[PDB]
Structure formats: C-alpha cells, structure tokens
Structure 1
Amino acid sequence: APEDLLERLLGEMELELIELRRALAQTIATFKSTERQRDAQQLIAQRWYEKAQAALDRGNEQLAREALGQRQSYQSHTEALGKSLGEQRALVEQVRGQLQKLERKYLELKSQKNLYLARLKSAIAAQKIEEIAGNLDNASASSLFERIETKILELEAERELLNPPPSPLDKKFEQWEEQQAVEATLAAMKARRS
C-alpha cells in the first residue's frame, strides 16, 4: 500500500537524523582533544620562556640562549597544531549547517504528508457515495430506484386487464344521468319548499 510507504520512508530518514547526529558529535570531541594538546605544548614552552626569563639577567646570556633553543622545538608543534585547530573549526560549523538545513527540510516534508493523505481520503471517501447515488436513481435507466417503477407499472398494468375500465360511453352517460337525478330530485324540492 503506497500510503504506508510515506510513513515508512520518513521513518528511515529519522534513523539518519540520529546517525548523522552521532557523527557530528564525534567530530567535536577530537577538536576539543586537539585544542587541549596545544595548550600543554605552549605551557612547556612558556615554562622555558618564564624559566629563560631568569638567566639572561645579571649577565648570564649563554644559559638563556640554550633555553630558547629548546623552546623552538615546542614552538614548531604549536604552529602546526595552531593552524590545524583553526582549519578544523570551519568543518564543525559547516557540518552543523547541513544538520540545521536537513532538520528543517524534514519537518516541512512531514507537514505536507498529512495534507495530501487527508485529501486522498476525502476523494476516496467521496467516490463510494456518489457512485451508488447514481446506481439508485440518478445515473440512468436500469437504476435500482427506477426499476421499482417498472414493477409498480407491471402490477398496475395488470389492474386494467383483470378488471377492464368502464367504456367512455358509460362514463359519458353515468355522469350525464346524474345531472337529472340531482335536478329532478331538486325539482320536487324547489317546488315543495316554494
């Protein structure tokens, strides 16, 4: 039944909106993990920078040079990690936009489903009333309602047969003779009560 599919297919989309949902979260975790790792590397570099801020004074230049040389190794990690974190930011914001748009498109699609299913029932619910209505007395001859008149006439047609109606002569006469009985009977009336 295709009308059931629209309920089933939208069910399948729902799995994605919870599968893609999980994928996005996993992306954020590593982004946070990468973010944390960068801070530690600079902290060690900062410690050498703070610690290097104690030798150059008072005339100990040699020691300060060595400390900064070590920090360059940690700085290189920070630079590589620093650029990556900024790059990864565009991905997390980009992917969320797809979720924002896709989620919007889903409920919008959901709304129209009922509006068309309702109009499907309305037309279907209309088919079987007007179809039979014509079958009864409106579509054409042979309609069940009209056929009743056929049986009525068939029996009524026998009525004039078994008991033939009076001839037009008698109809012309029986009424003819009533005009005299009424007047003749009234003739003795108008003359008696005069």
Structure 2
Amino acid sequence: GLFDRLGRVVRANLNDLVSKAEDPEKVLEQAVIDMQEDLVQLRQAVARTIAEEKRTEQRLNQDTQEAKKWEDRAKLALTNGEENLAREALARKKSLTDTAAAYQTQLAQQ
C-alpha cells in the first residue's frame, strides 16, 4: 500500500541518520566481535550434531545386543524342544535387525 511505503521512508530517514552517527571503523570491529560470537553459536550446534550422531549409534548397539539376547533365547528354546518359542524369539530378533538397518542408514547420513 502507498502509506506503508511512505511510512517506511519517514522511519528509514531517522534510522539512516542514526546509522550516520556511529563511526564505520568502530562499527566494523563491533561487526567482527559479533561475527566471532556467531561462530561461537555455530560450534555449539555442530558439536550437538556429533552428540546426536553418537546417540543413534548407541541405539544401534542397544538393538543389536538385544537381538543377540533373543538369539540366545531361541537357542535355549530349541535345546528344550519348544520350537514355537524359538519362532517367537526369531520374530523379536527380525524387528531388531530391521530397525538396526534403519539406524545404520540414519548414522550414514549423520
């Protein structure tokens, strides 16, 4: 709208006068100080991506050792002749190995 454009011009004239008032050499080193803290913000977020990457790798180790536990329960069921319980344990093992492949894919992206 026309009054939005006129409104921003009266506001911009006052803002430009304030921008003239500060020394560009002092504002340029303030900008370098500001840019140094901007790198401080980036390193915290980047480091947290490493922590998140390691967390998916922890879940992968949890689900893969849980699959080994269920395989041992399946082995126990087979020596006890309870083949129906061996199939039940194998079903738990399969969902853990299939989610482990999803976590491996997530970890590859990370």
User: Corresponding residue for 1:53?
Assistant: 75
1:86 aligned onto 2:104: no
User: Corresponding residue for 1:185?
Assistant: none
1:31 aligned onto 2:31: no
Normalised by the length of structure 1, the TM-score is 0.40
Q: Deviations over 1:42-71 (max 9, x none)?
A: 211110112222333475544422321221
User: Corresponding residue for 2:91?
Assistant: 69
Higher relative contact order (CA 8 A, sep 6+): 2
Q: CA deviation at 1:2?
A: 2.6
Q: Matches of 1:58 and 1:3 in 2, distance apart?
A: 83
Backbone CA RMSD of aligned residues = 2.1
Structure 1 spans left out of the alignment, 5+ residues: 89-194
Structure 2 spans left out of the alignment, 5+ residues: 1-22
| Higher gyration radius (CA) | 1
User: Corresponding residue for 1:22?
Assistant: 44
Normalised by the length of structure 2, the TM-score is 0.66
Q: Matches of 1:74 and 1:86 in 2, distance apart?
A: 18
Q: Matches of 1:17 and 1:68 in 2, distance apart?
A: 50
Q: Deviations over 1:59-87 (max 9, x none)?
A: 55444223212211222221211211111
Give the share of equivalent positions with the same residue, in percent. 38
SS of residue in 2 equivalent to 1:56: helix
Q: CA deviation at 1:8?
A: 1.8
Amino acid at match of 2:54: K
Amino acid at match of 1:45: A
Aligned match of 1:10 in 32, 36, 41?
32
Q: Deviations over 1:121-145 (max 9, x none)?
A: xxxxxxxxxxxxxxxxxxxxxxxxx
Q: Matches of 1:73 and 1:24 in 2, distance apart?
A: 32
Structure 1 residues 58 and 51, CA, compared in 2 at 3 Å: closer, same or farther?
closer
Amino acid at match of 2:95: S
